[PDB]
CSV table of C-alpha atoms and ligand atoms in Angstrom, one decimal:
chain,number,residue,atom,x,y,z
A,270,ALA,CA,128.8,155.1,102.6
A,271,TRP,CA,127.3,152.5,100.2
A,272,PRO,CA,127.5,148.8,101.2
A,273,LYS,CA,129.5,146.4,99.1
A,274,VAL,CA,127.0,143.6,98.3
A,275,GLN,CA,126.4,141.1,95.4
A,276,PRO,CA,123.9,142.1,92.7
A,277,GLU,CA,120.5,140.9,93.8
A,278,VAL,CA,118.9,140.9,90.3
A,279,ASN,CA,119.8,140.0,86.7
A,280,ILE,CA,118.5,142.1,83.8
A,281,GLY,CA,118.9,140.7,80.3
A,282,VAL,CA,119.8,143.0,77.4
A,283,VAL,CA,118.5,141.6,74.1
A,284,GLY,CA,117.6,142.7,70.6
A,285,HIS,CA,118.6,142.6,67.0
A,286,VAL,CA,122.2,142.8,65.8
A,287,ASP,CA,123.9,146.2,66.2
A,288,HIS,CA,120.9,147.9,67.9
A,289,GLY,CA,123.1,149.0,70.7
A,290,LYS,CA,122.8,146.5,73.6
A,291,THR,CA,126.4,146.7,74.7
A,292,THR,CA,126.6,150.4,74.4
A,293,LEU,CA,123.4,150.7,76.5
A,294,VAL,CA,125.0,148.5,79.2
A,295,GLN,CA,128.0,150.8,79.0
A,296,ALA,CA,125.9,153.9,79.4
A,297,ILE,CA,124.3,152.4,82.5
A,298,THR,CA,127.4,150.8,84.2
A,299,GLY,CA,130.4,152.5,82.7
A,300,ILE,CA,131.6,149.1,81.6
A,301,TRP,CA,132.2,147.6,78.1
A,302,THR,CA,131.2,143.9,78.3
A,303,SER,CA,133.2,142.5,75.4
A,304,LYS,CA,136.4,141.1,76.9
A,305,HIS,CA,137.4,138.5,74.3
A,306,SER,CA,139.9,139.4,71.6
A,307,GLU,CA,137.7,138.0,68.8
A,308,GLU,CA,134.8,140.2,70.0
A,309,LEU,CA,136.8,143.4,70.0
A,310,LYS,CA,138.4,142.5,66.7
A,311,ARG,CA,135.1,141.7,64.9
A,312,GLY,CA,133.1,144.4,66.7
A,313,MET,CA,130.4,142.1,68.0
A,314,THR,CA,129.2,140.4,71.2
A,315,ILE,CA,129.9,136.6,71.0
A,316,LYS,CA,129.9,135.3,74.6
A,317,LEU,CA,127.4,136.5,77.1
A,318,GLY,CA,128.6,139.9,78.4
A,319,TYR,CA,128.3,141.0,82.1
A,320,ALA,CA,128.4,144.2,84.1
A,321,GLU,CA,127.3,145.5,87.5
A,322,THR,CA,126.2,148.8,89.0
A,323,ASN,CA,124.8,150.2,92.3
A,324,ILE,CA,121.5,152.0,92.0
A,325,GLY,CA,120.6,154.8,94.4
A,326,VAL,CA,118.2,157.7,94.7
A,327,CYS,CA,118.6,161.3,95.9
A,328,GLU,CA,115.5,161.6,98.1
A,329,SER,CA,115.2,165.4,98.1
A,330,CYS,CA,115.7,165.8,94.3
A,331,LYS,CA,113.2,165.4,91.5
A,332,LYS,CA,112.8,162.2,89.5
A,333,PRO,CA,113.9,160.7,87.2
A,334,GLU,CA,117.2,162.7,87.5
A,335,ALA,CA,117.3,161.8,91.2
A,336,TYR,CA,118.2,158.2,90.3
A,337,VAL,CA,121.9,157.7,90.3
A,338,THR,CA,124.4,154.9,89.6
A,339,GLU,CA,127.0,156.2,92.0
A,340,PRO,CA,127.0,157.6,95.6
A,341,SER,CA,126.6,161.3,94.7
A,342,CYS,CA,123.8,163.8,94.6
A,343,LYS,CA,125.8,166.7,93.3
A,344,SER,CA,124.0,166.6,90.0
A,345,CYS,CA,120.9,167.8,91.8
A,346,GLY,CA,122.7,170.3,94.0
A,347,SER,CA,123.0,168.2,97.2
A,348,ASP,CA,126.1,167.3,99.2
A,349,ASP,CA,124.0,164.6,100.9
A,350,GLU,CA,124.6,160.9,100.1
A,351,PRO,CA,121.9,159.3,98.0
A,352,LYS,CA,119.9,156.4,99.6
A,353,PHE,CA,121.3,153.1,98.4
A,354,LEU,CA,118.5,151.0,96.7
A,355,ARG,CA,120.2,147.8,95.4
A,356,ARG,CA,123.0,146.5,93.2
A,357,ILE,CA,122.0,145.2,89.8
A,358,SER,CA,123.7,143.3,87.0
A,359,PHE,CA,123.2,142.9,83.3
A,360,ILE,CA,123.3,139.8,81.1
A,361,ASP,CA,124.4,141.2,77.7
A,362,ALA,CA,123.2,138.9,74.9
A,363,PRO,CA,124.6,138.7,71.3
A,364,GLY,CA,122.2,139.9,68.6
A,365,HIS,CA,123.6,138.0,65.6
A,366,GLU,CA,121.1,135.4,64.3
A,367,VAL,CA,123.8,132.7,64.2
A,368,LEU,CA,124.2,133.2,68.0
A,369,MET,CA,120.5,132.8,68.9
A,370,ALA,CA,121.4,129.7,71.1
A,371,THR,CA,123.7,131.9,73.2
A,372,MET,CA,120.8,134.3,73.8
A,373,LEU,CA,118.7,131.4,74.9
A,374,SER,CA,121.4,130.3,77.3
A,375,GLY,CA,121.5,133.8,78.7
A,376,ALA,CA,117.8,133.9,79.1
A,377,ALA,CA,117.9,131.1,81.7
A,378,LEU,CA,119.8,133.6,84.0
A,379,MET,CA,117.5,136.6,83.6
A,380,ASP,CA,115.1,137.9,86.3
A,381,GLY,CA,113.9,140.6,83.9
A,382,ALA,CA,115.0,142.1,80.5
A,383,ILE,CA,115.4,145.1,78.3
A,384,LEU,CA,114.6,144.6,74.7
A,385,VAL,CA,116.7,147.1,72.7
A,386,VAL,CA,115.0,148.4,69.5
A,387,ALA,CA,117.0,150.8,67.3
A,388,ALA,CA,114.9,153.8,66.4
A,389,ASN,CA,116.6,154.3,63.0
A,390,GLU,CA,115.9,150.7,61.7
A,391,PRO,CA,112.5,149.3,60.5
A,392,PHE,CA,110.6,147.6,63.3
A,393,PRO,CA,110.3,144.7,63.9
A,394,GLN,CA,113.6,143.1,62.8
A,395,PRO,CA,114.0,139.2,62.9
A,396,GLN,CA,115.9,139.1,66.2
A,397,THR,CA,113.8,141.7,67.8
A,398,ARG,CA,110.9,139.2,67.2
A,399,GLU,CA,113.0,136.1,68.1
A,400,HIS,CA,114.3,137.5,71.3
A,401,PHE,CA,110.9,138.9,72.3
A,402,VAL,CA,109.2,135.6,71.7
A,403,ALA,CA,112.0,133.7,73.5
A,404,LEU,CA,111.6,136.0,76.5
A,405,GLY,CA,107.8,135.3,76.6
A,406,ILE,CA,108.3,131.6,76.2
A,407,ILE,CA,110.9,131.4,79.0
A,408,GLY,CA,108.9,133.6,81.3
A,409,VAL,CA,111.2,136.6,81.5
A,410,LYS,CA,108.1,138.9,81.5
A,411,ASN,CA,109.3,141.8,83.6
A,412,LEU,CA,110.3,143.7,80.4
A,413,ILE,CA,111.2,147.2,79.4
A,414,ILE,CA,111.4,148.0,75.7
A,415,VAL,CA,114.0,150.7,75.0
A,416,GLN,CA,114.1,152.7,71.8
A,417,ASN,CA,117.8,153.3,71.4
A,418,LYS,CA,119.5,155.8,69.1
A,419,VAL,CA,116.7,158.4,69.3
A,420,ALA,CA,119.1,161.2,68.9
A,421,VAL,CA,119.6,160.5,65.2
A,422,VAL,CA,115.8,160.6,64.4
A,423,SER,CA,113.2,163.3,64.9
A,424,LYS,CA,110.6,163.1,67.7
A,425,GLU,CA,108.1,162.4,65.0
A,426,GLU,CA,109.9,159.3,63.6
A,427,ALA,CA,110.5,158.0,67.1
A,428,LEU,CA,106.8,158.4,67.8
A,429,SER,CA,105.8,156.6,64.6
A,430,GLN,CA,108.0,153.6,65.6
A,431,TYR,CA,106.5,153.8,69.2
A,432,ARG,CA,103.1,153.3,67.7
A,433,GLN,CA,104.4,150.3,65.8
A,434,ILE,CA,105.7,148.8,69.0
A,435,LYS,CA,102.4,149.3,70.8
A,436,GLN,CA,100.7,147.7,67.8
A,437,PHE,CA,103.1,144.7,68.0
A,438,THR,CA,102.8,144.2,71.8
A,439,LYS,CA,99.0,144.6,71.7
A,440,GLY,CA,97.2,141.3,72.3
A,441,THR,CA,100.3,139.8,73.9
A,442,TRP,CA,101.6,139.4,77.4
A,443,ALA,CA,103.7,142.5,76.7
A,444,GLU,CA,100.7,144.8,75.9
A,445,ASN,CA,101.4,147.2,78.8
A,446,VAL,CA,105.2,147.0,78.7
A,447,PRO,CA,106.7,150.5,79.0
A,448,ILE,CA,108.7,151.9,76.0
A,449,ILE,CA,111.6,154.3,77.0
A,450,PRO,CA,113.6,156.3,74.4
A,451,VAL,CA,117.3,156.8,75.0
A,452,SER,CA,120.6,157.4,73.3
A,453,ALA,CA,123.1,154.9,74.6
A,454,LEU,CA,126.0,156.4,72.7
A,455,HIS,CA,125.4,160.0,73.7
A,456,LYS,CA,123.9,159.2,77.0
A,457,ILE,CA,120.5,160.8,76.7
A,458,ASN,CA,117.5,160.1,78.9
A,459,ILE,CA,119.3,157.4,80.8
A,460,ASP,CA,117.8,158.5,84.1
A,461,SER,CA,114.3,157.6,82.8
A,462,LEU,CA,115.7,154.2,82.0
A,463,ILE,CA,117.0,153.8,85.6
A,464,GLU,CA,113.6,154.9,87.0
A,465,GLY,CA,111.9,152.4,84.6
A,466,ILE,CA,114.2,149.6,85.9
A,467,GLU,CA,113.3,150.4,89.5
A,468,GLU,CA,109.6,150.5,88.7
A,469,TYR,CA,109.2,147.6,86.3
A,470,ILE,CA,112.0,145.1,87.2
A,471,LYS,CA,111.6,144.5,90.9
A,472,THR,CA,114.0,142.1,92.7
A,473,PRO,CA,112.0,138.8,92.8
A,474,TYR,CA,111.4,136.9,96.0
A,475,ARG,CA,114.0,134.2,96.6
A,476,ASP,CA,113.2,131.1,98.6
A,477,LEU,CA,116.7,130.3,100.0
A,478,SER,CA,115.5,127.0,101.5
A,479,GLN,CA,115.5,125.4,98.1
A,480,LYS,CA,118.3,123.2,97.0
A,481,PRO,CA,121.2,125.2,95.6
A,482,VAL,CA,121.4,125.1,91.8
A,483,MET,CA,123.9,127.1,89.6
A,484,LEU,CA,123.7,127.3,85.8
A,485,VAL,CA,127.2,127.5,84.3
A,486,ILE,CA,128.1,129.8,81.4
A,487,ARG,CA,131.9,130.3,82.0
A,488,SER,CA,134.9,128.4,83.2
A,489,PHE,CA,138.5,129.5,83.1
A,490,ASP,CA,142.2,129.2,84.2
A,491,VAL,CA,143.1,132.4,86.0
A,492,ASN,CA,146.8,131.7,86.1
A,493,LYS,CA,149.3,133.8,84.2
A,494,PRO,CA,151.5,131.9,81.7
A,495,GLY,CA,154.7,130.6,83.1
A,496,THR,CA,153.2,130.4,86.5
A,497,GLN,CA,155.1,128.1,88.9
A,498,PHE,CA,153.3,124.8,89.4
A,499,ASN,CA,153.2,125.1,93.2
A,500,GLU,CA,151.5,128.5,92.7
A,501,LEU,CA,148.9,127.3,90.2
A,502,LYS,CA,145.4,128.4,91.4
A,503,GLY,CA,142.5,126.0,91.1
A,504,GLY,CA,140.0,126.2,88.2
A,505,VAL,CA,137.2,128.8,88.3
A,506,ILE,CA,133.6,128.3,87.3
A,507,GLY,CA,131.2,131.1,86.5
A,508,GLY,CA,127.5,131.3,86.2
A,509,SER,CA,124.3,132.3,88.0
A,510,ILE,CA,122.5,130.8,91.0
A,511,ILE,CA,118.9,130.2,90.0
A,512,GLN,CA,117.8,128.9,93.4
A,513,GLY,CA,119.1,128.5,96.9
A,514,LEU,CA,122.6,129.7,98.0
A,515,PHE,CA,126.2,128.5,98.0
A,516,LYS,CA,128.8,129.0,100.6
A,517,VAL,CA,132.6,128.8,100.8
A,518,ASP,CA,133.9,125.3,101.6
A,519,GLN,CA,130.7,123.5,100.5
A,520,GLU,CA,131.2,120.2,98.7
A,521,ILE,CA,129.8,120.6,95.2
A,522,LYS,CA,129.5,118.7,92.0
A,523,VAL,CA,129.4,119.7,88.3
A,524,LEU,CA,126.8,117.9,86.2
A,525,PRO,CA,126.8,116.1,83.9
A,526,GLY,CA,130.5,116.6,84.5
A,527,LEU,CA,133.5,115.6,82.3
A,528,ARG,CA,133.7,113.8,79.1
A,529,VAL,CA,135.5,110.4,79.5
A,530,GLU,CA,136.9,108.5,76.5
A,531,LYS,CA,137.5,104.8,76.9
A,532,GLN,CA,138.8,103.4,73.6
A,533,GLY,CA,136.5,105.6,71.5
A,534,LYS,CA,133.6,105.0,73.8
A,535,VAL,CA,132.4,108.2,75.4
A,536,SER,CA,130.6,108.8,78.7
A,537,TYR,CA,130.2,111.6,81.3
A,538,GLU,CA,131.0,111.5,85.0
A,539,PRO,CA,130.2,114.1,87.7
A,540,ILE,CA,133.1,116.4,88.7
A,541,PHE,CA,133.4,116.5,92.5
A,542,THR,CA,135.1,119.5,94.1
A,543,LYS,CA,135.0,122.1,96.9
A,544,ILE,CA,134.3,125.8,96.8
A,545,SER,CA,137.5,127.6,97.7
A,546,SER,CA,136.3,131.1,96.9
A,547,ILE,CA,133.3,133.2,95.9
A,548,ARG,CA,133.5,136.4,93.9
A,549,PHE,CA,131.1,138.9,92.2
A,550,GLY,CA,133.0,141.3,90.1
A,551,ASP,CA,136.0,142.6,92.1
A,552,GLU,CA,134.5,141.7,95.5
A,553,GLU,CA,134.9,138.5,97.5
A,554,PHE,CA,132.0,137.1,99.6
A,555,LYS,CA,131.4,134.1,101.9
A,556,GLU,CA,128.1,133.2,100.3
A,557,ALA,CA,126.4,133.5,96.9
A,558,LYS,CA,122.7,134.0,96.2
A,559,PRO,CA,120.6,134.4,93.1
A,560,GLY,CA,121.3,137.6,91.2
A,561,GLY,CA,124.6,138.5,89.6
A,562,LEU,CA,127.2,136.4,87.9
A,563,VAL,CA,129.3,134.5,90.4
A,564,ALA,CA,132.9,133.2,90.1
A,565,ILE,CA,133.3,130.0,92.1
A,566,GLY,CA,136.9,129.2,92.9
A,567,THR,CA,137.5,125.4,93.3
A,568,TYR,CA,140.3,122.9,93.9
A,569,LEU,CA,140.0,121.6,90.3
A,570,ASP,CA,143.0,121.3,88.0
A,571,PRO,CA,142.8,124.5,85.8
A,572,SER,CA,143.1,122.4,82.7
A,573,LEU,CA,139.6,121.1,83.5
A,574,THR,CA,138.0,124.6,83.5
A,575,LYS,CA,140.1,126.2,80.7
A,576,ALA,CA,138.3,128.1,77.9
A,577,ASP,CA,134.7,127.7,79.0
A,578,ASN,CA,135.0,123.9,78.9
A,579,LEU,CA,132.1,123.5,81.4
A,580,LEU,CA,129.6,125.8,79.6
A,581,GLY,CA,126.1,124.4,80.0
A,582,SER,CA,126.8,122.4,83.1
A,583,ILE,CA,125.1,122.9,86.4
A,584,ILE,CA,126.6,122.9,89.9
A,585,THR,CA,124.8,121.5,92.9
A,586,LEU,CA,125.7,120.3,96.4
A,587,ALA,CA,127.6,117.0,96.2
A,588,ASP,CA,124.7,114.9,97.8
A,589,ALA,CA,121.9,116.3,95.6
A,590,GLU,CA,120.0,113.8,93.5
A,591,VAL,CA,119.9,115.0,89.9
A,592,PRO,CA,118.9,113.0,86.8
A,593,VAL,CA,121.5,113.2,84.1
A,594,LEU,CA,119.7,112.2,80.9
A,595,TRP,CA,120.7,111.1,77.4
A,596,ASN,CA,117.1,110.8,76.5
A,597,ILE,CA,114.3,113.2,77.4
A,598,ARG,CA,110.5,113.4,77.1
A,599,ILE,CA,109.2,116.9,76.3
A,600,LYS,CA,105.7,118.2,76.6
A,601,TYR,CA,105.9,120.7,73.7
A,602,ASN,CA,104.1,123.4,71.7
A,603,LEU,CA,105.2,124.9,68.4
A,604,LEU,CA,105.1,128.5,67.2
A,605,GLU,CA,103.0,129.1,64.0
A,606,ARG,CA,106.0,130.8,62.3
A,607,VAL,CA,109.7,130.8,62.3
A,608,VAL,CA,109.8,134.3,63.8
A,609,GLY,CA,113.6,134.7,63.5
A,610,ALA,CA,113.7,134.1,59.7
A,611,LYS,CA,114.1,137.0,57.3
A,612,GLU,CA,111.3,135.6,55.0
A,613,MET,CA,108.1,134.4,56.5
A,614,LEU,CA,108.0,130.6,57.1
A,615,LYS,CA,105.5,128.3,58.6
A,616,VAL,CA,106.8,125.9,61.3
A,617,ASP,CA,106.5,122.3,60.0
A,618,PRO,CA,105.4,119.7,62.6
A,619,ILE,CA,108.1,117.6,64.3
A,620,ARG,CA,109.0,114.6,62.2
A,621,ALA,CA,110.5,111.3,63.5
A,622,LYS,CA,114.3,111.0,63.2
A,623,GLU,CA,114.6,114.8,62.7
A,624,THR,CA,117.6,116.4,64.4
A,625,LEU,CA,116.6,119.2,66.8
A,626,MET,CA,118.5,121.6,69.0
A,627,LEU,CA,117.4,121.8,72.7
A,628,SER,CA,118.1,124.6,75.0
A,629,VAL,CA,117.8,123.6,78.7
A,630,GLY,CA,119.1,125.9,81.3
A,631,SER,CA,122.5,127.2,80.0
A,632,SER,CA,123.0,124.1,77.9
A,633,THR,CA,122.6,123.6,74.2
A,634,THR,CA,122.3,120.1,72.8
A,635,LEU,CA,121.5,118.3,69.5
A,636,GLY,CA,119.2,115.3,69.6
A,637,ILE,CA,117.2,112.9,67.4
A,638,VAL,CA,113.5,112.6,67.7
A,639,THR,CA,112.6,109.0,68.6
A,640,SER,CA,108.9,109.6,69.2
A,641,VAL,CA,106.3,112.1,68.0
A,642,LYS,CA,102.9,112.7,69.5
A,643,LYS,CA,100.6,115.8,69.5
A,644,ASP,CA,101.7,117.1,72.9
A,645,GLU,CA,104.9,115.1,73.5
A,646,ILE,CA,108.2,114.2,71.8
A,647,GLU,CA,111.0,111.9,73.0
A,648,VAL,CA,114.6,112.8,72.1
A,649,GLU,CA,117.9,110.9,72.1
A,650,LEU,CA,120.6,113.4,72.9
A,651,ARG,CA,124.2,113.5,71.7
A,652,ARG,CA,125.4,114.6,75.1
A,653,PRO,CA,123.6,114.2,78.5
A,654,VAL,CA,121.7,117.1,80.2
A,655,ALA,CA,121.3,117.7,83.9
A,656,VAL,CA,117.6,118.0,84.9
A,657,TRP,CA,117.5,119.6,88.3
A,658,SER,CA,113.7,119.8,88.7
A,659,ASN,CA,110.5,118.7,87.0
A,660,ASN,CA,108.9,121.0,84.4
A,661,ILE,CA,112.0,122.9,83.4
A,662,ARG,CA,111.4,125.0,80.2
A,663,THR,CA,113.2,123.9,77.1
A,664,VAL,CA,113.4,125.8,73.8
A,665,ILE,CA,113.3,123.9,70.6
A,666,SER,CA,115.2,124.9,67.5
A,667,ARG,CA,115.4,123.5,63.9
A,668,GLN,CA,118.1,123.9,61.3
A,669,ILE,CA,116.5,126.0,58.5
A,670,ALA,CA,118.6,127.1,55.5
A,671,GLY,CA,121.8,126.2,57.4
A,672,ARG,CA,120.7,128.3,60.4
A,673,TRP,CA,119.4,127.1,63.8
A,674,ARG,CA,116.0,128.9,64.3
A,675,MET,CA,113.7,128.8,67.3
A,676,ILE,CA,110.4,126.9,66.4
A,677,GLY,CA,108.9,126.0,69.7
A,678,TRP,CA,109.2,125.2,73.4
A,679,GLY,CA,108.2,122.7,76.1
A,680,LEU,CA,108.6,121.2,79.6
A,681,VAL,CA,111.1,118.5,80.3
A,682,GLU,CA,109.2,115.7,81.9
A,683,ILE,CA,110.9,113.4,84.3
B,806,GCP,N1,123.9,156.7,66.9
B,806,GCP,C1,123.9,155.7,67.9
B,806,GCP,N2,124.7,154.7,67.6
B,806,GCP,C2,124.8,153.7,68.6
B,806,GCP,C3,124.0,153.8,69.8
B,806,GCP,N3,124.3,152.7,70.5
B,806,GCP,C4,125.2,151.9,69.8
B,806,GCP,N4,125.5,152.5,68.6
B,806,GCP,C5,126.4,152.1,67.5
B,806,GCP,O1,125.9,150.8,67.0
B,806,GCP,C6,127.1,150.0,66.8
B,806,GCP,C7,126.9,148.7,67.6
B,806,GCP,O2,126.8,149.0,68.9
B,806,GCP,P1,126.7,147.8,70.1
B,806,GCP,O3,126.5,148.5,71.4
B,806,GCP,O4,127.9,146.9,69.9
B,806,GCP,O5,125.4,147.1,69.5
B,806,GCP,P2,125.2,145.6,69.9
B,806,GCP,O6,123.7,145.3,69.8
B,806,GCP,O7,125.7,145.2,71.4
B,806,GCP,C8,126.0,144.6,68.6
B,806,GCP,P3,125.8,142.8,68.9
B,806,GCP,O8,124.4,142.4,68.5
B,806,GCP,O9,126.8,142.0,68.0
B,806,GCP,O10,126.0,142.4,70.4
B,806,GCP,C9,128.3,150.7,67.2
B,806,GCP,O11,128.9,151.4,66.1
B,806,GCP,C10,127.7,151.8,68.1
B,806,GCP,O12,128.6,153.0,68.1
B,806,GCP,C11,123.2,155.0,70.0
B,806,GCP,O13,122.5,155.1,71.0
B,806,GCP,N5,123.2,155.9,69.0
B,807,MG,MG1,126.7,143.5,72.0
B,808,NA,NA1,114.4,133.8,85.4
């Protein structure tokens, strides 16, 4: 039988609005990632979506069909069990331009990515570009480009767009990135995509001796309403471990922590707690490593974790030394153009006292520029940010025409 293990790798799913990211994840995993009522109602991804699957291979059968997502080789005429390869998981990002920040958050959790390009829409759409560039900037470079919805266009049209994609990636880090055509909705050529995932998105090496750091994207109260107080379960915090590993019963802290109000005056203080449980999907474990989205059960009052209250926090061991900063210095570079805009726009240089949006790990924070130089800016933040290492990538956004747009990136210097 196949072992029950945590996912060992995170694959982002990005691309322009309605190009079929969520349906693609469903075609691969059998799971629809949209869990929130507002998402199902409006017909869009809003929060980061998540889904897991095992990946195996039928060793006597021919590829790519030999690749499977369940322990069966019957589809190639074998009664033998397929060889288990690994468990993988998907970080399903929203495509809407207004939700770019959320994509950025998700990108901090990705080991690799699939860029979904609809074959029946003109390439390259604004968020195709913005997500692509974001991936490059952040360093998520194990990329597969998927042409989705090919079953509604002729082979000729698909090939025309394929040529466009090669032209686009030529001269960039993605020049030799593979392009794989599928229909997510009708489940066509999915096997080729699985094969591509095995070939192009290897599980990266993990140095488990590093200090444990988890980036937080979820937090919730798992109690049913009208639950008896003496049966109230502790708050749960969800996210991905980007380095090291966590274990049940470890003393941990959430940084920057909780918002404290003292007569209108606002500060943040670390939340200290203890790991009471560890879960990936429907399975419980004793330890949690990079790869997958983990649910950390704690002894926290559920009111503290309710409704993603802790989104953008990090979790570390209680004794870790981590700067929590209300001002940061960033060694930066700007893009030439606002790639996410419908109409072409040049990026203006950073101006003093300008308000910018900074993406750091899973966090998104507004700040005011207090110093501008050619290679460096300094920023006074509205809320503090936890900086767990030197030279963490940040992505810089500017409000253009009422919309926050990515305009550059940098390294947080401590
Ligand atoms: N014809 C066809 N339609 C598809 C395919 N994949 C998705 N769609 C359609 O596109 C629409 C949006 O699909 P969805 O998977 O939600 O796209 P999405 O990119 O996740 C939307 P968002 O950007 O808000 O997260 C749906 O009507 C869906 O049926 C496909 O392979 N072929
Ligand atoms: Mg979606
Ligand atoms: Na990564």
